[PDB]
Amino acid sequence: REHWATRLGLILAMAGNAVGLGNFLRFPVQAAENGGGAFMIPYIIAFLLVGIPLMWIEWAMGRYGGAQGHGTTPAIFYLLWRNRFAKILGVFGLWIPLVVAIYYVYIESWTLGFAIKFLVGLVPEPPPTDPDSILRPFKEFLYSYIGVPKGDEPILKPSLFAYIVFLITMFINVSILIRGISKGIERFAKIAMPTLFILAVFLVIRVFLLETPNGTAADGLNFLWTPDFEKLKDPGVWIAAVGQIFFTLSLGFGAIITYASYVRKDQDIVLSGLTAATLNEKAEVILGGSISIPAAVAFFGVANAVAIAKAGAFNLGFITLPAIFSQTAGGTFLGFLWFFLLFFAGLTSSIAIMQPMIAFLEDELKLSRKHAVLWTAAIVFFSAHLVMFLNKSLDEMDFWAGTIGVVFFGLTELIIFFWIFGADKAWEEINRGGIIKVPRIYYYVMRYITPAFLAVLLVVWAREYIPKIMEETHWTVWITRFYIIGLFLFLTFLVFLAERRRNHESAGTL
Numbered sequence: 001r002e003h004w005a006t007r008l009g010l011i012l013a014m015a016g017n018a019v020g021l022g023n024f025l026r027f028p029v030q031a032a033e034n035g036g037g038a039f040m041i042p043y044i045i046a047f048l049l050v051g052i053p054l055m056w057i058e059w060a061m062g063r064y065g066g067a068q069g070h071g072t073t074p075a076i077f078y079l080l081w082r083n084r085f086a087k088i089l090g091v092f093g094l095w096i097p098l099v100v101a102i103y104y105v106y107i108e109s110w111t112l113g114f115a116i117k118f119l120v121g122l123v124p125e126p127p128p129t130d131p132d133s134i135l136r137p138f139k140e141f142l143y144s145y146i147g148v149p150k151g152d153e154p155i156l157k158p159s160l161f162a163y164i165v166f167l168i169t170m171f172i173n174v175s176i177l178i179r180g181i182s183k184g185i186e187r188f189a190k191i192a193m194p195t196l197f198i199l200a201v202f203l204v205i206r207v208f209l210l211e212t213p214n215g216t217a218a219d220g221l222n223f224l225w226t227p228d229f230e231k232l233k234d235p236g237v238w239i240a241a242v243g244q245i246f247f248t249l250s251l252g253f254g255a256i257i258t259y260a261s262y263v264r265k266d267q268d269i270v271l272s273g274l275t276a277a278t279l280n281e282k283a284e285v286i287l288g289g290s291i292s293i294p295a296a297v298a299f300f301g302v303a304n305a306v307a308i309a310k311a312g313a314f315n316l317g318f319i320t321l322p323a324i325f326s327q328t329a330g331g332t333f334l335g336f337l338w339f340f341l342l343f344f345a346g347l348t349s350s351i352a353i354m355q356p357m358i359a360f361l362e363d364e365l366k367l368s369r370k371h372a373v374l375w376t377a378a379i380v381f382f383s384a385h386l387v388m389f390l391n392k393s394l395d396e397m398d399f400w401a402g403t404i405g406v407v408f409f410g411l412t413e414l415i416i417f418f419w420i421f422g423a424d425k426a427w428e429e430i431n432r433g434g435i436i437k438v439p440r441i442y443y444y445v446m447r448y449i450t451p452a453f454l455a456v457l458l459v460v461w462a463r464e465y466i467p468k469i470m471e472e473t474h475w476t477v478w479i480t481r482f483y484i485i486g487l488f489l490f491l492t493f494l495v496f497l498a499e500r501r502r503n504h505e506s507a508g509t510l
């Protein structure tokens with residue numbers, strides 16, 4: 001099996017897996033949408049009771065599977081629980097990352113497209129101080145790029161440039177993946193993460209200098225870091241907080257597990273896993289939290305900034321920040337740096353959610369890396385047309401796979417590893433080779449707290465939220481549901497074929 005070459009390479013690759021669009025785009029919206037500081041308490045608690053423990057569990061499962069030549073859940077779940085149903089539940093470890101990649105790579109391509117256009121100055125000329133007259137040009141810019149519906153039909157019409165950029169983006173992802181783990185993903189991470197960190201720090205500094213008659217960046221930080229102990233009682237904020245923790249740490253996507261399957265069997269995963277997790281959190285709360293929110297608040301005040309985030313999820317990152325920057329000297333270039341940052345953050349994460357499918361095809365169906373990467377790219381490219389042309393398809397996929405799916409899968413993997421496989425066998429597997437041991441209290445958290453926490457969350461989700469999504473959405477949501485259910489069927493068929501190949505190969509081993 002391929003293995004990460006260096007400890008630094010491993011850490012930066014895992015850090016790049018985690019640090020992405022979730023840190024700079026998703027986090028600000030979730031926080032601004034849920035009261036800022038009021039969102040942070042449940043967030044921090046979720047990180048301690050869910051994020052950290054699950055991270056160690058996934059690293060352990062991955063390393064454990066990798067030692068036997070398996071990097072994905074269909075096989076790993078079976079290793080931990082030799083029951084056919086383990087293989088079926090394992091399919092989610094291929095389905096979730098594939099479905100997320102199908103829309104994630106497209107959003108990533110928008111950042112490359114914007115970066116290009118901002119670099120060459122093909123951007124809107126706002127007018128020369130009425131907020132709408134300032135934001136409208138940028139809103140139109142985004143809307144024309146992705147092709148937002150102007151009429152009643154739920155159809156999107158992406159610009160030709162956007163389509164071509166998606167193609168280029170897919171090519172770039174392929175160029176990294178086709179070189180493999182050490183010479184591809186690891187090598188790239190050593191270049192991308194330093195760049196990402198530097199660009200992000202620079203942007204924070206520039207945003208911190210923003211002052212207007214409406215406020216300063218400081219007012220933004222105060223909004224995000226001031227506790228509101230009176231929301232701690234709202235399930236919605238908790239659901240939002242936990243969902244963000246999963247998404248931002250790449251947990252429940254089968255991605256951490258696959259990356260860890262390339263860690264040598266003897267290697268530490270305790271300190272490594274904790275470091276990757278802490279690195280992501282710093283990038284999220286310190287860097288991602290200090291850019292778009294402070295900027296929006298400084299220029300429009302808290303009440304307006306919040307209204308902006310609630311009106312549209314991509315407003316802050318793709319419309320508001322660039323609009324604000326355009327009001328300052330060299331703003332178009334700052335816009336370029338912002339989208340360039342988002343692109344690298346996205347690229348390092350998208351290669352992480354495509355690798356599971358690649359690992360499955362290599363490990364279980366024995367395809368060459370070249371063929372595994374190309375077929376995976378073809379499936380994602382083809383499937384992405386649904387997200388590019390059908391309005392709200394992206395939201396549907398992000399919900400089923402990227403939101404509820406990951407929480408369900410996180411609970412599932414914990415049960416299979418800590419309950420079925422054996423809590424003591426699991427605890428032993430996690431700590432084996434650790435540079436540091438996992439704090440003892442966490443054994444009780446993993447075995448009782450985490451699963452109980454998630455179980456309650458999921459029940460509240462299915463009872464007071466999932467019905468509205470099943471009853472109040474446009475009929476076209478069924479087009480997406482149908483297609484992704486088909487993808488699950490297809491992946492299950494591939495796992496069935498891997499079974500038969502194994503049987504064929506065994507009866508050849510006799």
Ligand SMILES: CCCCCCCCO[C@@H]1O[C@H](CO)[C@@H](O)[C@H](O)[C@H]1O
Pocket residue numbers: 157158159160161163382385
């Ligand atoms: C291989 C699967 C192909 C599915 C049909 C894809 C059709 C894409 O079609 C292309 O879309 C672009 C963006 O909207 C347009 O700018 C191009 O003019 C148009 O030809």
Ligand SMILES: CCCCCCCCO[C@@H]1O[C@H](CO)[C@@H](O)[C@H](O)[C@H]1O
Pocket residue numbers: 116160161164
């Ligand atoms: C990264 C380089 C992307 C180049 C494609 C840019 C597409 C932007 O725009 C397109 O350009 C075409 C040729 O210039 C024209 O024929 C199309 O009508 C026009 O919409």
Ligand SMILES: CCCCCCCCO[C@@H]1O[C@H](CO)[C@@H](O)[C@H](O)[C@H]1O
Pocket residue numbers: 156157158385386387389390
């Ligand atoms: C579920 C995904 C379906 C993808 C089918 C896409 C078919 C593309 O259709 C094409 O789109 C272009 C740009 O929007 C138009 O200019 C062309 O006239 C139209 O035929």
Ligand SMILES: CCCCCCCCO[C@@H]1O[C@H](CO)[C@@H](O)[C@H](O)[C@H]1O
Pocket residue numbers: 155156386389390479
């Ligand atoms: C979910 C997939 C949505 C795809 C949107 C496709 C819009 C394509 O465009 C439509 O194609 C039709 C047949 O080719 C033509 O009859 C229509 O006049 C044309 O507007």
Ligand SMILES: CCCCCCCCO[C@@H]1O[C@H](CO)[C@@H](O)[C@H](O)[C@H]1O
Pocket residue numbers: 048049438439440441445
């Ligand atoms: C809810 C999860 C909280 C995790 C915080 C853990 C802080 C670590 O706590 C420390 O762990 C060591 C090893 O078990 C003990 O020897 C120390 O006495 C204890 O203070």
Ligand SMILES: CNCCCN1c2ccccc2CCc2ccccc21
Pocket residue numbers: 021022025026029030104107312313314394395398
């Ligand atoms: C229009 N709905 C967007 C849903 C996808 N999305 C989310 C989800 C919640 C809050 C904000 C955002 C915007 C940023 C983002 C980035 C990467 C993947 C999904 C998303």
Ligand SMILES: CNCCCN1c2ccccc2CCc2ccccc21
Pocket residue numbers: 172175176179183184187188191
């Ligand atoms: C100067 N060498 C770094 C550039 C090459 N690099 C990048 C960086 C950004 C976008 C694409 C690529 C191409 C593929 C690749 C693969 C492995 C390491 C670096 C890179």
Ligand SMILES: CC(C)C[C@H](N)C(=O)O
Pocket residue numbers: 017018019020021022023100247248249250253255349350352353
């Ligand atoms: C799906 C994951 C790879 C997403 C990544 N953790 C992010 O925060 O953008």
Ligand code: NA
Pocket residue numbers: 018019020022023247248249250280284
């Ligand atoms: Na993240």
Ligand code: NA
Pocket residue numbers: 015016017018019020021344345346347348349350
């Ligand atoms: Na990333």
